[PDB]
Amino acid sequence: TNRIEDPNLVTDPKELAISQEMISDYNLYVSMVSTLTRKGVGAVETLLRS
Amino acid sequence: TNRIEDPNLVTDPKELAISQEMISDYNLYVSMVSTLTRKGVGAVETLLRS
Amino acid sequence: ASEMRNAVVSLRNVSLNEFNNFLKRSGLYNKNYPLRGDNRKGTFYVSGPPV
Amino acid sequence: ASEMRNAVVSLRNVSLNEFNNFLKRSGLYNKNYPLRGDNRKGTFYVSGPPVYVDMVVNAATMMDKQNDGIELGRQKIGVMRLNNTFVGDRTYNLRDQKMVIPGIATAIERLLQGEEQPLGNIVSSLQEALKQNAAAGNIKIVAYPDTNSLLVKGTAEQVHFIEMLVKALDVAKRHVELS
Amino acid sequence: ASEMRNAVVSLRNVSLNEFNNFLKRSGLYNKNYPLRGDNRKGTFYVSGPPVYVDMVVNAATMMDKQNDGIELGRQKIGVMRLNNTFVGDRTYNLRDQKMVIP
Amino acid sequence: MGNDISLIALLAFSTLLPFIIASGTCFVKFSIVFVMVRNALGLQQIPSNMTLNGVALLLSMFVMWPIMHDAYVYFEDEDVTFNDISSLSKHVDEGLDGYRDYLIKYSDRELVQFFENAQLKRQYGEETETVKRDKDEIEKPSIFALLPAYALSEIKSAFKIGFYLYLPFVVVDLVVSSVLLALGMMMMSPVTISTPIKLVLFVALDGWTLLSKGLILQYMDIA
Amino acid sequence: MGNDISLIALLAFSTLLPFIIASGTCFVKFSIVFVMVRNALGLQQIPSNMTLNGVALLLSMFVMWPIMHDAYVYFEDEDVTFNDISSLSKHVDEGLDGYRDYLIKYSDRELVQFFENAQLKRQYGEETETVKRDKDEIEKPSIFALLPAYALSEIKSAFKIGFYLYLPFVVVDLVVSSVLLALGMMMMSPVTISTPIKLVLFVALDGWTLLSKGLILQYMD
Amino acid sequence: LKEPVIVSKMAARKKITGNFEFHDPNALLEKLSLQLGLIWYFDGQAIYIYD
Amino acid sequence: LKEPVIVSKMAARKKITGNFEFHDPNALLEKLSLQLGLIWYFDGQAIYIYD
Amino acid sequence: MFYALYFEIHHLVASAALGFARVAPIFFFLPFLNSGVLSGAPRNAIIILVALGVWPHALNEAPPFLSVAMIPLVLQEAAVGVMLGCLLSWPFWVMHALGCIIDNQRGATLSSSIDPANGIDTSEMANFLNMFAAVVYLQNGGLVTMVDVLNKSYQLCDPMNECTPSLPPLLTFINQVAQNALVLASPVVLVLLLSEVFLGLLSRFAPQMNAFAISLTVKSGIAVLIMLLYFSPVLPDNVLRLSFQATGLSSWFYERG
Amino acid sequence: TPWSGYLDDNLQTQVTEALDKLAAKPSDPALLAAYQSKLSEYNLYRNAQSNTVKVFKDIDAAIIQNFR
Ligand SMILES: CCCCCCCCCCCC[N+](C)(C)[O-]
């Protein structure tokens, strides 16, 4: 958020190229934590309903 | 707000960027409650059958 | 009877008296459902069976 | 009875007193549900059974569009003789100056040139108001020396005003002797 | 009674008197629910049964828009004879200077 | 908005909820005792499993719902501040002590300690256990250590209770049989006679009511 | 299309269509009766749900088609009909009476009255007089109030029909159980013997003919 | 009062009991407004009463 | 007081008992304010009271 | 104000979602609503419509619960719904018990099977009497009283006031159900006992007679014969005297807030 | 396309005419001055029209593609 509110960061190609990476890495991280958590509880559920 | 200030502020880019947050967040909150109630009822049915 | 249709028609280039003669020559005219309007002007109301 | 419908209708090229005549000739008029409004103006209220209301509102809208195509600003040509003066401009070559005296046509034309509001009066009903709206800049004057007369083109009102102004202007001149 | 409707209307080309005369000629006027405002001005408050209110609002709006097709700033012409001086500009050909009086 | 990890934790928890209830709550005991008594009366499918499970579920909520509500009231508390992963871990752990205490109350110390050893001691090169003085570890057995030790103790309690309820019905069966023999009315099966008697006697004494009170009074005061 | 909002509304309607069919059409009833029949014969997985819902949807088509066609030509009709907001809202409202008449003709008067009164007491306040329209012309009730009354009415009547069909098979079962006890074969599970007797009974009746005939004749004279 | 009266949804909850004489409804209206905690207004066509 | 009075919900939670005399009610009001821990105000049309 | 209709639709769906938690358990218990009958796409569509038909507050103003922890609330509502499901079920469980007692006395032990829609062991008689009660109940219009008691449950105790079932009366419930069933089944049990003792007495004069085996041939006919006589009162007995009523909500529920 | 049931070319000829007059005497300054104006107005008219027709196509397409 700060990297976007601040006007000298959001308008210099050097800084934008870095922010693009930060955003993508955030996305991937959260998506993987979510996936593995679901797989985990789903295993418990599969065994106990069997 | 019912007949105070004015309607139709589809057009100013500063208030139109505040509406985006609310219009998204309330849709997410309502979507979440829909799942929690199904989970709860399903847990009760699971125990009562078993 | 419940099917009677009706409509308002208006013509730019052709007067009512010009059109009635057309129907008469065609043998399509029917005195039970004649056109209602001003023979001079080109605007009229008609009602009757669908066809 | 619960099905009673009603509407407000407004017109631009026709008057309520006109449209009544249309209904009468058609044989569609119904004195139980007459149109209520001002004969002089184009806005009225109507209420009644569905079929009646729909027919009325259709017919009135389409007749208004049909009359929308007809112009009524008939241009009138007036011919005015001058009895006391010459129609043309004239030049007098003083020693000190080239001097010019403008005639009536030139003066009036220069005055009305580019006018946009209507011409009202001179000092020293919707179908009427829409005639009274005619702009002052359309008036055209052409000097015709062959008969010492002016040709004036405009509405009947405009021509009348021009006539008055001409008769306010062409006074007969006095003679002076210098010794 | 609970169905009473009310509204505020504001017109630019039409006087409250003009509108009241329209209603009277129409035979639509009703002294239990008259229009409230300044005869001089175009801004009034109206309250009453649904049909009455809706009709009044529609009629007023349409009448107001219609009159934009009208113009009343009638131009007028006056003739003013000068009794004490010549109308035109005058040039004085001084032997050393040409002087102009507007 | 909120925090995207606390959202995951909320949704995950709500999927596991019925297995937690089924394995770490007094529901375990209530649902057993009723079904045992029903078998002892000798007439299955009266009351229905629907009736029994429904009641057991409702009663379990009086015991457990206050503890969950207390925990959420602990977390919705705007005055805290943190500095590090440790300082946050401590505060989140502290939130669960209300539940931890309940499990500690109703379970065996030595079986808990055994599992507390078993989580680690495959790691350990040593035999000494004193190496931490008890006051921390006695308070802080892990919840995964407490859970199975609690369930295994609840079952045993259920059997203990049901045992004593079987005895009077046995007595009634012996009495009926001895009477049929003393009358010599030999060739009649006694069950046909004694199951009506067991039913009428237990209902006429409201066994189910006394039973329900006697179960709840281990966990609450009704007043 | 001649107007954009008229298009947006059509795409929304086409996105909610299936729930309207699932909750406001005879499909809700046919679907129940066939499952009741399968329960009665003591079967578990055959015929499949996809086969029974297939025939239930086909049969519902013969019954609903006429009013969907009527609404279609009513909204296509090219003759000039509306001018202004009040005339448009009345034109749209008038176009739905072909379907309000349907819901009203099969909904139970008592339920319709309950859901209407309970809305009046939400909007205007519970002190508003409880109507007790015991002799009634229900004044074009709102469709949100009318629709759940239809849904519960169809569930009621479908259950009612399903009850009648059990009674022969119930007889079959109790008879078989009595003759086995008369022979003392207490260890024999009756279901093995009674299942084929049920099947041949139903086939001799020709159940599906009678039943599918009557279910349709209930909706048309 | 000789005027139609409109009472809000939240005022309609309150209850009153007794005999009342309508010698001067304006005075009675003011007294009861202050006693029961209501506010009211009069546009010239109708009276409106609120909590 | 001769003025309509409007009470916040957080003030509505508080209960009171006894026998009271309403004379010089402004003085009574400002005393109770301090005893009960309320704050109050008057815009010229009505009295507002808050916790 | 432009967005007001959009927010007004979202207030509607949030209210319906919180109503489902309280209406769906009833659909689980009752014998004409469970998923043995009503299943697939209709099921949710109907439950939601009912919940909106009975929600107590104007649907177009913001829901009051936005400030509260969601789980404690959802569990509270589900518990309330389970209690209502039991109280409305009450007339059917008695007839089911009656049928189980009869089928047990006449022998017939092996006939039963577990119903997949509910997980309950179901005899041959019990299923019949359990249906027959449902149809007479529906015929008498009990269906109206069911929605009625739902609506009243919302007016008399509100989600936001932490409504709770009363503990003392809940503790009697199982025993009242068993009592009613026994009191009603008794007349058949008595005659079948007298019958078997009569045969045992008769056996004294012919000790080779298998008086047990004779009784199995006889008792099923006796059972059906006697129940056929006392059958017609079954219609009034259940329809009114056992059906729950909106007036009882006062005693079974109270507000803790 | 009409909204079903809802109640409710000279510049081309003028340019053609001016072209025919001019073609007969390309050296007349008055015919040149007139044609310049007619052609300029016709050009602007055609451009404004075709831009507007595209803008409406693209709104209808965006609506459909939103639900598609
Ligand atoms: C029935 C479960 C859902 C509601 C939660 C009930 C929480 C327990 C409240 C018990 C109060 C007992 N009491 C009054 C003696 O304290």
The resolution, in angstroms to one decimal, equals 3.3
Q: Which domain holds residue D160?
A: 69-113+139-173
Instruction: Please compute Rg for chain J using Cα positions.
Output: 24
**How far apart are the CA of F145 and the centre of ligand 1, in A?**
29
Residue of the CA atom closest to atom 14 of ligand 1: F223
CB spacing of B36 vs F14 below 8 angstroms: yes
The DSSP-derived string for F5-26 is HHHHHHHHHHHHHHHHHHHSST
Question: CA-to-CA distance for G195 and I39, rounded, in angstroms?
Answer: 82
The DSSP-derived string for K7-45 is ---HHHHHHHHHHHHHHH-TT-HHHHHHHHHHHHHHHHH
Question: CA-to-CA distance for J136 and J129, rounded, in angstroms?
Answer: 11
What distance, in Å, lies between the first and last C-alpha atoms of chain E?
76
Question: CA-to-CA distance for D134 and B2, rounded, in angstroms?
Answer: 46
CA J256 to chain centre: 26
- Closest atom of ligand 1 to J164 CA is 4
Of the CA atoms within 13 Å of residue D145, those in its CB half-sphere come to 6
Q: H-helix or E-strand containing E47?
A: strand E43-48
Q: Six-digit token pair at F215?
A: 């179960």
Looking up tokens 């949807």 gives G57
Question: CA-to-CA distance for A42 and A16, rounded, in angstroms?
Answer: 40
- Bridge-partner residues for J255, per DSSP? J163
Q: Which residues of F touch J69 (CB under 8 A)?
A: 69, 72, 76
Mutation choice for F interface testing from B21, B31, B47 by most F CBs within 10 A:
B47
Residues counted in chain C: 51
Non-local CB neighbours of G87 within 8 Å, separated by 6+ positions = D5, D7, G81
- Bridge-partner residues for D150, per DSSP? D80, D143
Of the CA atoms within 13 Å of residue F128, those in its CB half-sphere come to 4
Non-local CB neighbours of J54 within 8 Å, separated by 6+ positions = G118, J19, J23, J147, J150, J151, J154
Closest CA relative to residue J241, chosen from J156, J187, J193, J183? J183
Mutation choice for F interface testing from A41, A44, A45 by most F CBs within 10 A:
A41
Non-local CB neighbours of J155 within 8 Å, separated by 6+ positions = J56
Non-local CB neighbours of G45 within 8 Å, separated by 6+ positions = none
**How far apart are the CA of K17 and the centre of ligand 1, in A?**
95
Contact C45, D28 (CB under 8 A): yes
Q: Which residues of B touch F57 (CB under 8 A)?
A: 44, 47-48
Q: Six-digit token pair at E6?
A: 């009310």
The runs of H, that is alpha helices, within G77-127 are 85-95, 97-106, 109-123
Closest CA relative to residue C49, chosen from C27, C33, C37? C33
Question: CA-to-CA distance for F153 and F161, rounded, in angstroms?
Answer: 13
Q: What are phi and psi of D27, to 5 degrees?
A: 80, 25
CB-nearest to G182 from J141, J217, J224 is J217
Q: Six-digit token pair at F32?
A: 């057993």
Q: What are phi and psi of F128, to 5 degrees?
A: -65, 135
Q: Is H24 helix (H, G, I), strand (E, B) or coil?
A: coil
Contact J137, J89 (CB under 8 A): no
Burial of C41: CB neighbours in 10 Å, binned 0-12, 13-18, 19+: middle
Torsion sign (Cα): D163, D169, D171, D175: negative
Looking up tokens 């009040």 gives G86
Cis omega (within 30 of 0) for bond into G47 = yes
CA D12 to chain centre: 17
Q: What are phi and psi of E94, to 5 degrees?
A: -60, 140
Helix G49-76, helix G97-106: angle, nearest 10: 140
Most distant pair of Cα atoms in chain F: their distance: 87
The beta-carbon contacts of F143-148 under 8 Å, at least 24 apart in sequence, are F143/F96, F143/F99, F143/F100, F143/F103, F144/F119, F145/F112, F145/F115, F145/F116, F145/F119, F146/F100, F146/F103, F146/F104, F146/F107, F146/F112, F147/F23, F147/F24, F147/F103, F148/F115
Contact E8, E47 (CB under 8 A): no
Q: Residue J222 is which amino acid?
A: I
Question: CA-to-CA distance for C38 and D18, rounded, in angstroms?
Answer: 12
Non-local CB neighbours of G145 within 8 Å, separated by 6+ positions = G112, G115, G116, G119, J53
CB spacing of J93 vs F47 below 8 angstroms: yes
Q: Residue D141 is which amino acid?
A: I
Exposure class string for G84-94: b at 16+ Cβ within 10 A, else e: eeebeeeeeee
- Bridge-partner residues for D77, per DSSP? D153
**Sheet arrangement for strand I47-50:** I5-7, I47-50, I39-42
Q: Six-digit token pair at F2?
A: 């909120």
The runs of H, that is alpha helices, within chain F are 4-23, 27-40, 49-75, 85-105, 109-118, 134-139, 143-182, 191-204, 207-216
CB spacing of E33 vs H45 below 8 angstroms: yes
Question: CA-to-CA distance for J126 and F47, rounded, in angstroms?
Answer: 13
CB spacing of A48 vs F19 below 8 angstroms: yes
Q: Six-digit token pair at E70?
A: 């009208």
The DSSP-derived string for D91-130 is EEE-SS-EEEE--HHHHHHHHHTT--SPEEEEE--HHHHH
Torsion sign (Cα): G101, G155, G151, G66: negative
Contact E36, E46 (CB under 8 A): yes
Q: Which residues of G touch J122 (CB under 8 A)?
A: none
Torsion sign (Cα): G78, G79, G80, G85: negative
Contact H25, H1 (CB under 8 A): yes
CB proximity under 8 Å: E 11-70 to D:
22, 25-28, 51, 55, 58-59, 62-63, 66, 69-70
The DSSP-derived string for J198-254 is HHHHHHTT-TTS-HHHHHHHHHHHHHHHHHHHTTTTHHHIIIIIIS--GGGHHHHEE
Q: Six-digit token pair at J105?
A: 């006395």
Looking up tokens 């949030």 gives J14
Contact F19, A44 (CB under 8 A): yes
Closest CA relative to residue G109, chosen from G79, G136, G139, G148? G136
Contact D92, D7 (CB under 8 A): no
Q: Residue G4 is which amino acid?
A: D
Q: H-helix or E-strand containing H39?
A: strand H39-42
Contact G184, G213 (CB under 8 A): no
Cis omega (within 30 of 0) for bond into A7 = no
Q: Which residues of G touch D58 (CB under 8 A)?
A: 80
Site to substitute for ligand 1 among J71, J173, J256, most atoms within 8 A of C-beta:
J256
Residues from K contacting D (CB-CB < 8 Å) are 7-8
Contact G112, G141 (CB under 8 A): yes
Question: CA-to-CA distance for C44 and C35, rounded, in angstroms?
Answer: 7
Contact G107, J144 (CB under 8 A): no
Contact J54, J151 (CB under 8 A): yes
Question: CA-to-CA distance for H5 and H2, rounded, in angstroms?
Answer: 9
Rounded to 5°, angle at Cα G155 from G150 and G156: 95
The runs of H, that is alpha helices, within J115-172 are 124-139, 142-156, 167-170
Q: Residue D122 is which amino acid?
A: I
Question: CA-to-CA distance for F30 and J170, rounded, in angstroms?
Answer: 15
- How far, in Å, are F50, F174, G46, J147 from residue B41 at the CA level? 16, 47, 29, 20
Q: H-helix or E-strand containing G195?
A: helix G191-205
The DSSP-derived string for A1-50 is -HHHHSTTTTT-HHHHHHHHHHHHHHHHHHHHHHHHHHHHHHHHHHHHH-
Question: CA-to-CA distance for D44 and I25, rounded, in angstroms?
Answer: 61
Q: What are phi and psi of J163, to 5 degrees?
A: -65, 145
Experimental method: cryo-EM
Burial of D24: CB neighbours in 10 Å, binned 0-12, 13-18, 19+: exposed
Non-local CB neighbours of E47 within 8 Å, separated by 6+ positions = E4, E5, E6, E7, E33, E53, H43, H45, H46
**Sheet arrangement for strand H5-7:** H5-7, H47-50, H39-42
Q: Is F92 helix (H, G, I), strand (E, B) or coil?
A: helix
What distance, in Å, lies between the first and last C-alpha atoms of chain K?
22
Q: Six-digit token pair at G110?
A: 């008592």
**How far apart are the CA of F62 and the centre of ligand 1, in A?**
5
Q: Residue D59 is which amino acid?
A: A
Residues counted in chain G: 221
The DSSP-derived string for chain D is -TT-EEEEEE-SS--HHHHHHHHHHHT---TTS--EE-TTSSEEEEEE-HHHHHHHHHHHHHHHHHHTT------EEEEEE-SSS-SS-EEEE-SS-EEEE--HHHHHHHHHTT--SPEEEEE--HHHHHHHT--GGG-EEEEEGGGTEEEEEE-HHHHHHHHHHHHHH-PPPP-----
* Residue F79: DSSP 8-state: T
Q: What are phi and psi of D122, to 5 degrees?
A: -130, 135
Q: Which domain holds residue K47?
A: 1-68
Closest CA relative to residue F7, chosen from J22, B35, B21, A21? B35
Residues counted in chain J: 257
Q: What are phi and psi of J170, to 5 degrees?
A: -60, -35
Q: Six-digit token pair at F5?
A: 């990890």
Q: How many CB atoms lie within 10 A of CB D127?
A: 13
Checking DSSP bridges between strand D5-10 and strand C36-37, what pairing results, if any?
unpaired
Question: CA-to-CA distance for G163 and E24, rounded, in angstroms?
Answer: 71
Closest CA relative to residue J185, chosen from J106, J250, J255? J106
Residues from G contacting C (CB-CB < 8 Å) are 79-80
Question: CA-to-CA distance for F30 and F213, rounded, in angstroms?
Answer: 12
- Closest atom of ligand 1 to F62 CA is 8
Q: Is E89 helix (H, G, I), strand (E, B) or coil?
A: coil
Question: CA-to-CA distance for G125 and E74, rounded, in angstroms?
Answer: 61
CA G204 to chain centre: 28
Q: Six-digit token pair at D152?
A: 């004036």
Checking DSSP bridges between strand D140-144 and strand E5-10, what pairing results, if any?
unpaired
- How far, in Å, are K10, K12, K34, K38, K40 from residue K17 at the CA level? 11, 9, 11, 10, 15
**How far apart are the CA of J161 and the centre of ligand 1, in A?**
13
Exposure class string for I14-39: b at 16+ Cβ within 10 A, else e: eeeeeeeeeeeeeeebeeeeeeeebe
Torsion sign (Cα): J176, J177, J180, J182: negative
CB-nearest to G80 from D5, D7, D58 is D58
How many independent structural domains does chain K possess? Answer: 1
